[PDB]
Amino acid sequence: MGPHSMRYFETAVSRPEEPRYISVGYVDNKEFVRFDSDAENPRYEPRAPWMEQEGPEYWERETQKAKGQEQWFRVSLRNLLGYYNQSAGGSHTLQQMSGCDLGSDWRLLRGYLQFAYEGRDYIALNEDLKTWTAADMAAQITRRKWEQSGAAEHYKAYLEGECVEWLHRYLKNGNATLLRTDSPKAHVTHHPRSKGEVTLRCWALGFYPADITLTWQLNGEELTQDMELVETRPAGDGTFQKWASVVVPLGKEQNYTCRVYHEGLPEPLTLRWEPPSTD
């Protein structure tokens, strides 16, 4: 759904051994490439099978770039120790998210470049792709350095250019697979509680992509705070699961309906609990 996007999520973790560097690329929220410095032969690898349309030169070039990034994160973690007046030791985490959302003219809609240190927002490039916002005092040092050295122009050129150009290539190559959806298979289960009341649980299983909406109604009217939802979770086969439950009075089960919305469904599913047939 929505605009097409590309993202690269990068992490460098220092450990009590040099930092571990991990880079994961996404197209439309689906992992498509991955580099991990802790692998036996560290290289960018296809994570979506349609990426095998690329030749061996693509993987070698991406791998060489990852080697540069690994060094950049290593130097940056070292500068970060100095900013917080620390000597080397323990574990520290530096993360980066970057990428683009594709506009209706196939040009950049929104560009992203954000950093976190120790799980806290550190610095980000603003929407204008020209200015920075620093979150703390150490980040103000990075901000002044990047402003004085013309860093934003380098990132803007990537976001507006290369990022959008390659995203279009990936969308073309992965078209068949990328448009694919797996509709949720839905059902309602009935469970006992403490005094005879009933838990109705609406299950949505085996769906793809992960985005979904589960709702409960009592006589067609939406239920809000009485609804328990679990966070969407991976089934392990590339598909997802979710459930939403309501506590109802016994014998009043038929007055309730669940409705599931998903991009795989031509029409949202409306279902109710019915006692299953038994022997």
Partner: peptide, 10 residues
Amino acid sequence: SSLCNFRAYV
């Protein structure tokens, strides 16, 4: 295509 960060480190 992954990004190569600018020459200025954090």
